[PDB]
Design a protein around this ligand. Sequence first.
Ligand SMILES: CCN1C(=O)CN([C@H]2[C@H](O)[C@@H]3O[C@H]2c2ccccc23)C1=O
Ligand SMILES: [Cl-]
Ligand SMILES: [Cl-]
Ligand SMILES: [Cl-]
Ligand SMILES: [Cl-]
Ligand SMILES: [Cl-]
Ligand SMILES: [Cl-]
Ligand SMILES: [Mg+2]
Length: 344
Amino acid sequence: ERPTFYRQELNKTIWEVPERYQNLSPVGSYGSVCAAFDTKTGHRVAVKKLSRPFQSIIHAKRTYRELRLLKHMKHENVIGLLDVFTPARSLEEFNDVYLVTHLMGADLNNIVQKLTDDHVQFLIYQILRGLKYIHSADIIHRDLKPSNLAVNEDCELKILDFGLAHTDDEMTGYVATRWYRAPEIMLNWMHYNQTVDIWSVGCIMAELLTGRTLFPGTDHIDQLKLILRLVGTPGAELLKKISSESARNYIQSLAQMPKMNFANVFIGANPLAVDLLEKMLVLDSDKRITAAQALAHAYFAQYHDPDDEPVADPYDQSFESRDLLIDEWKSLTYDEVISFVPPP
Ligand SMILES: CCN1C(=O)CN([C@H]2[C@H](O)[C@@H]3O[C@H]2c2ccccc23)C1=O
Ligand SMILES: [Cl-]
Ligand SMILES: [Cl-]
Ligand SMILES: [Cl-]
Ligand SMILES: [Cl-]
Ligand SMILES: [Cl-]
Ligand SMILES: [Cl-]
Ligand SMILES: [Mg+2]
């Protein structure tokens, strides 16, 4: 039943893992990561040891959230969970959590090379295919950007690093951590929803077409000015939807600007790519195209197959409004570890 574990020290950390995982080598350091060879499946894998998973109520709940999300995701264009384990033999001695996934090599930055329009079609198609699945479970990724997209030699893509809810310092200044975020979440205009992810896809697609960041702001306000120059200042309809009165007041201090001609911004791009960008990069989130609608856009005619674009099983997020003690979150996490069933 229970595998045999072995111990070793890897850069000031003790790792205790099943014998199936061999040739551990550190790679990065919310947790430390090692690459390894999985002798049961033949895959190269990433193994993450969570750091201080149950040190506070906030941290214990985040550990449970990450494990629940990773156990649910079962789609070709989304990261999946190969294994989860603990060396503990009972709840009473439970302290450490380890997560295992396929080892990812290059991200989209390490290719964004010389991309043809056919490459852009295939890459964005796969992002939207994974997003249709994610959004069908009422999950919001929140942190889509090139470093969170893994790509292999055959141009096949997986979404990873779901937003588990970044600090104020992480979002300050001339930083890629903010350049892909929708304005309504960057500035806390209103309660946001899954449409924030489509704004990020528009920003990524633009950068694949031009080779340049679309909105490389030096701070929050500089970035807003770059955004409004392209898409136009808001009308009265959107202004009514901004719940923050102070944010409303600041927007109205800016001189009004019309939306620009996207064919004159994205010079020489496929006219169908220009059309899709105009439908993604809409300031009013209610009016953006959805992932399911975008898959049917003529830009993807070569790849679209409505019989091979699956949706997710329902995902129960009621725990997110639940108030529990550290040891109750810990017990819920332990149950999810021991009930894990590996993929075929
Ligand atoms: C170093 C390369 N690499 C990956 O291959 C996956 N990945 C991250 C995944 O999104 C999630 O956090 C990290 C991780 C490691 C193991 C299990 C689950 C996770 C990551 O950083
Ligand atoms: Cl083993
Ligand atoms: Cl995977
Ligand atoms: Cl343990
Ligand atoms: Cl990035
Ligand atoms: Cl659901
Ligand atoms: Cl569920
Ligand atoms: Mg990341």
